Amino acid sequence: HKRMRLSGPQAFDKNEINSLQSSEGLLEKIIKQAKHIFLRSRAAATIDSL
């Protein structure tokens, strides 16, 4: 990768290094998206009732 090369001379912390190499999954991301959608819908309905 390019930023993993840039990590050497342009010195990176722990957080940028771990952010470049993140171990996530399709399921995790999809669940997060679904949760956000549900929350949005909920807030919308609540304000509508209000």
Contacts with another protein, residue ranges (CB under 8 A)? 2, 5-15, 17
Least gap, CB of 21 to another protein (angstroms) = 11
Give the nearer residue to another protein in terms of CB position, either 8 or 25.
8
Retrieve residue 34's tokens.
């679904």
Give the nearer residue to another protein in terms of CB position, either 14 or 49.
14
What 3-state DSSP class applies to 9? Answer: coil
Least gap, CB of 30 to another protein (angstroms) = 18
3-state helix, strand, coil in the chain (%, to 5): 70, 0, 30
